[PDB]
Amino acid sequence: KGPVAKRDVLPDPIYNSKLVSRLINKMMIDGKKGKSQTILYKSFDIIKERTGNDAMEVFEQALKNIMPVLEVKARRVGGANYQVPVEVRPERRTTLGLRWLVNYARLRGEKTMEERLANEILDAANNTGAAVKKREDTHKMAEANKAFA
Amino acid sequence: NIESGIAHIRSTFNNTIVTITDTHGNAISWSSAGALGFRGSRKSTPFAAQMAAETAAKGSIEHGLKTLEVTVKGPGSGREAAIRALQAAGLEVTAIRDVTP
Amino acid sequence: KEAFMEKLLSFMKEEAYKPLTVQELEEMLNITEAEEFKELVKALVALEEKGLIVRTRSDRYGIPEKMNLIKGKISAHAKGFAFLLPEDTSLSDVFIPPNELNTAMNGDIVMVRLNSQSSGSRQEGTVIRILERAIQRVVGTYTETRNFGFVIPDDKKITSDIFIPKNGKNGAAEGHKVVVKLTSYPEGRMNAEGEVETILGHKNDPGIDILSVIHKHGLPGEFPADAMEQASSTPDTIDEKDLKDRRDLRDQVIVTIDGADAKDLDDAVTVTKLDDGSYKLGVHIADVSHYVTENSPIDKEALERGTSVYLVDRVIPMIPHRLSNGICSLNPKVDRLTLSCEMTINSQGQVTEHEIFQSVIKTTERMTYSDVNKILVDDDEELKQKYEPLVPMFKDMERLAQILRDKRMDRGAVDFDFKEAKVLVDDEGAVKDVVIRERSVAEKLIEEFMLVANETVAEHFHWMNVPFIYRIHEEPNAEKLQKFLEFVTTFGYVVKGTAGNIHPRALQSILDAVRDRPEETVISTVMLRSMKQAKYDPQSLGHFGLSTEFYTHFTSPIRRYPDLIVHRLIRTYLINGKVDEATQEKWAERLPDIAEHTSSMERRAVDAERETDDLKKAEYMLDKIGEEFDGMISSVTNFGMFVELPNTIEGLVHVSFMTDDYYRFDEQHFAMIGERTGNVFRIGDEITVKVVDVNKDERNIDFEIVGM
Amino acid sequence: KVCYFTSNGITHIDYKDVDLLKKFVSERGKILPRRVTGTNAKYQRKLTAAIKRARQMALLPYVS
RNA sequence: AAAAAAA
RNA sequence: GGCGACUCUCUGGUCUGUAACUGACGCUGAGGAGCGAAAGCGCGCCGUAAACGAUGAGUGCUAAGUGUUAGGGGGUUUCCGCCCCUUAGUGCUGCAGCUAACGCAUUAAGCACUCCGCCUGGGGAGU
User: Fold this and answer.
1) Is Repressor among this UniProt entry's keywords (chain B)?
2) Cβ contact (<8 Å) for D28 and B98?
């Protein structure tokens, strides 16, 4: 009945960003937060070595481009079947940002995850790749059925 | 070339037709919400009825009308906006008359 | 089809393009054939579907992209939503959902993106940008918590509590009404933060309720020290030097007719009947421009004040009490400087001749409206005997005022005679009674004399063709009037005209037909709601409500800054003869800003006076919980219906209290219809209500239906 | 809300006095109820007839 | 809710 | 049973006021005679029908308080105007009483008297 409070994660110790921590917890498998803490700190050294920019400048830019603005929600009142355009709550923006970032990074062709995650962030930051596309995809779809809401 | 005429407005829940006639009921011109490309909910609205009265009126002004008697039919929302489309098009309204059967 | 759509879009893409209707697009494109008209409607629908144009809910097509947007003012609601009021008043209001406000507060000038689809009857939009912030200060009740304070705003349109940090308390205690200054606006999930600028007092202390309203609106407080020094140095009597170049009218029979409690006597009048049967009317107004000179301390303050504000328990005056009540006031049987307008008026109410000049008067008697009515109407022999020399003049004044009224109504003026409340308070500011304000013969007599003075001055200066200030009332909003015409047609009242070209006499042709009917009050009320507000302007654009081409305010300079300017321009152009190009250009530059400012200060005033009345009306009904009253349905909505009592107190019947049936709102008929019972509660229906609850803080009165 | 005819001492409502009658019909021409007019039942009956005689002789309309 | 006007 | 457009012709009854006249000429009414939803059917026959306030008719009597229809009178009031008083209904609420209860309560289902109709378990069977 009353919106449950989301669990207050700690800031990532080296970037002081609770966003970066949330990425670690998204990447973490079978409670192996160590593996994911390593992978990211390996991925962000890869970003900083290539770009020269701070990984935080790029990662926040990457999230901006992945983060959705409007989403499709199924509504079946009587008939309807209306894909109601819904504005993504700011917490659900980051959620879907980090989910897609990680989900598509794992699917990439590169050998190691630290490189795969680095390259997906670098592609996301350049407003390209697959995770940015996925946001576009649902917006193209939300624009397509924008007649409802 | 006739001056006095009736403006028969049939405002239904689906549509608003506006014929304009002479005193003998011979049709000078007409226009409907459906004739102006409105469809579905839009045909019912008083905006389409207003707009249907204008194109009907501007058709009649060519034939050279000046005064209109008005007859309204039906339960639609168009009659008030359509009539004020006939006074706004230029043709003076002598008398309205609800002739809903 | 595509070439025509492009040609329409290019036309709308021109920099001079404003949003136009289908008819205004038809005229502008010179479409005369019926088939080209079909093309246009088909092009407009196809472009609107593509989102390349947007129809506003006033049926005006605009290129969104040059906006994708509409610039306008936020009008917030207490339930967290808002409307955009566009700058272009021809455009319709855009609904803004609470989630789409994006930190925009009540009154903020914003840019709103238009939503291609709507979830209701009106066009939706999202606030993309805030161009100007309206609210900087907030009045509210301070509440104390363990480690911080908050202030609950008195403006309920501010739906979030203002966070006061522990250092921004500045001595405010639990229950104190407080003036907060906003240090931060709401952002994301954070409320606004602010610091307590001023403590007004405790909310339960006498007069703090009205003192919270004064501060809410930002009404002017104490006079500056230099203004009060100027006032205290101003002589209590006329200097002999000031009698030079003034017409001596001290030997004439000149009277003031005012309220019994009035001390700021602006006007004094005389009427002499001439041998031919024409009347000579003298109107003699307080020469405030003499005492208050241009760029004086009082002048700078009066401009800032713009008008006197008349709240329930007090008056906030435009000029200090030493001048307004002392040397400017036309006090009885003392010499007073005036600026006169003297008028010979024929048997049809036509001003054949007039003169405007400076004079000195000595008023023969200070009369009251009550006394003048008792002489004329009640035929009171005791008062006639008391004022035996003045009775013949009063009878000539009555006849002349009737003459002027007849011509006024024949010209097609709209006599809007509604029952206004007068709240009666005691010395502590507690409500004693709420009575109807009745306009008598004596008030309608002076009204006509100030009106004919006010038109006469306005006509004189129009033809002189010099920079001047007018009191204009523009033609009503065609959409608002179109709705009003539709409304009265349900009661049967058919009006001759269209909403774009109505003559003032047409609307009166309604108010007469409804006179002494149950539906009078509400048709009256809804007619008002379709009218524009009158403002000040340097162009003589006419006055719709009075059905006149020339009108200004000349007759009340003590309490109106536009009248005090009219006095200066009279002294500049006629008396001093200063009609030079450098004088004209000086006034031509200043009058637009003055006219805009004083018009703002008037609206501010009227809003503030009302708010105090509605507060004290609510205070009055606190002790009437459980009592039954007859009333008349003054407004119906989807949530309930408002009920106006005989004293002009209004309340809500909420639909929850209508327990006998499920009631559906009919928007066209303005009626709540029971589904099962078939009970119909319409606008204008007399019902008997009972007082259920009264909230003074919110100004709410809550009824239930006893019987029809 | 007083009855015009008990007020103005009017025993006989005549169908020919159109302008009087016209004080009691609607704008559509329908007969105004007694409630709304404040008329006496007696006279309302009287009036009503008058009107129906007036409407028959095309002095008043049936439908405006 | 909503207007002149007046004060 | 019933009776709602308007006008006219013709005709029945009702109430209010005065008491000039008549002088108990009244009341009920089996039978009979007439009228009579809806039909039924063939303008006639038909003649029964929640044709049931679910309450014969008549009269006298027994707290109020309030609304309405048509009247009468008084008060001041010019007159409206309220106010008071009454009569004939038509309504609500509610004593005393009555009821098995529910209710009825001066429009009694209260207290009395006259006359008529009508009932005496359910079903069989209104056969």
Assistant:
1) no
2) yes
Which chains border B (3 or more CB–CB pairs < 8 Å)? C, D
Task: Please choose, from the candidates C442, C444, C454, the residue with its C-alpha nearest in 3D space to the C-alpha of residue C416.
Answer: C444
Q: Beta carbon of C634 within 7 Å of strand E?
A: yes
Q: For residues B77 and B49, is the Cβ–Cβ distance under 8 A? A: yes
d(CA C389, CA C201): 54
Which chain D residues are within 8 Å of B98, Cβ to Cβ?
Answer: 28, 63
Chain position carrying tokens 């606030």: C127
Cα distance between residue C299 and residue C318, in whole Å: 10
Report helix, strand or coil for C592.
Answer: helix
Residue of C nearest to D22 (CA): C513
Are C514 and C524 in contact, with CB atoms under 8 Å apart? yes
And the tokens for A143? 């624009």
Beta bridge partners of C535: C472
What is the experimental method? cryo-EM
SS3 letters across C281-339:
EEEEEECHHHHCCCCCHHHHHHHHHCECEECCCCEECCCCHHHHHHHCCCCCCCEEEEE
The span from the CA of B46 to the CA of B49, in Å, is 5
Rounded-to-integer distance, Cα C581 and Cα C89, Å: 36
Strands (E), C392-505: 420-425, 431-437, 470-472
Please give the C-alpha separations between residue A32 and each of A15, A36, C667, in angstroms, as whole numbers: 20, 7, 63
Give φ, ψ of C38 to 5 degrees.
-60, -45
> Chain B to chain C, count of Cβ pairs less than 8 Å apart?
30
Interface contact flag, D26 C492, Cβ < 8 Å:
yes
| Strand E close to C93 by CB, under 7 A | no
- The rounded distance, in Å, linking the Cα atoms of C266 and C317 is 13
Which residues of chain B lie closer than 8 angstroms to C59, CB-CB? 47
Q: Containing H/E element for C76? A: strand C69-76
For the CA of D38 and the C1' of F75, the distance in angstroms is 26
Half-sphere exposure of C148 (CA within 13 A, CB side): 10
User: Phi and psi of C218, rounded to 5°?
Assistant: 80, 40
b/e map of A67-105 (b: 16 or more CB within 10 Å)?
bbebbbeeeeeeeeebbbbebbeeeebbbbbbebbbebb
Going by C-alpha positions, the residue among C182, C24, C6 that lies closest to residue C88 is: C24
Instruction: Please answer whether residues C63 and C13 qualify as being in contact, where contact means their C-beta atoms are separated by less than 8 angstroms.
Output: yes
Cβ of D27 and C492 within 8 Å? yes
Q: How far apart are CA A113 and CA A24, in angstroms?
A: 13
Alpha-carbon distance of C405 to C50, in angstroms, equals 57
- D11: Cβ under 7 Å from strand F? no
Return all residues near A139 (Cβ < 8 A) that are at least 6 apart: A68, A69, A70
Contact C9, C45 (CB under 8 A): no
Give the CB-side neighbour count of residue C49, counting CA atoms within 13 A: 7
Report the relative pairing of strands C69-76 and C82-86 from DSSP bridges: antiparallel
Q: What is the H or E stretch that residue C407 is in? A: helix C391-410
Establish if C59 touches chain B: CB-CB under 8 angstroms.
Answer: yes
C-beta of residue C704 within 8 angstroms of C-beta of residue C689:
yes
Q: Are the beta carbons of C117 and A149 separated by less than 8 Å?
A: yes
DSSP output for B54-95: HHHHHHHHHHT--EEEEEEESS-S-HHHHHHHHTTTT-EE--
Please state, in angstroms and rounded to a whole number, the distance separating the CA atoms of residues B96 and B30: 18
Q: Residue C452: name the closest of C406, C497, C500, C518 by CA.
A: C406
For the record, the structure tokens of C321 come out as 């009490």
Phi/psi of residue C650, each to 5°?
-115, 150
Q: Does C517 sit within 8 Å of D28, measured CB to CB? A: no
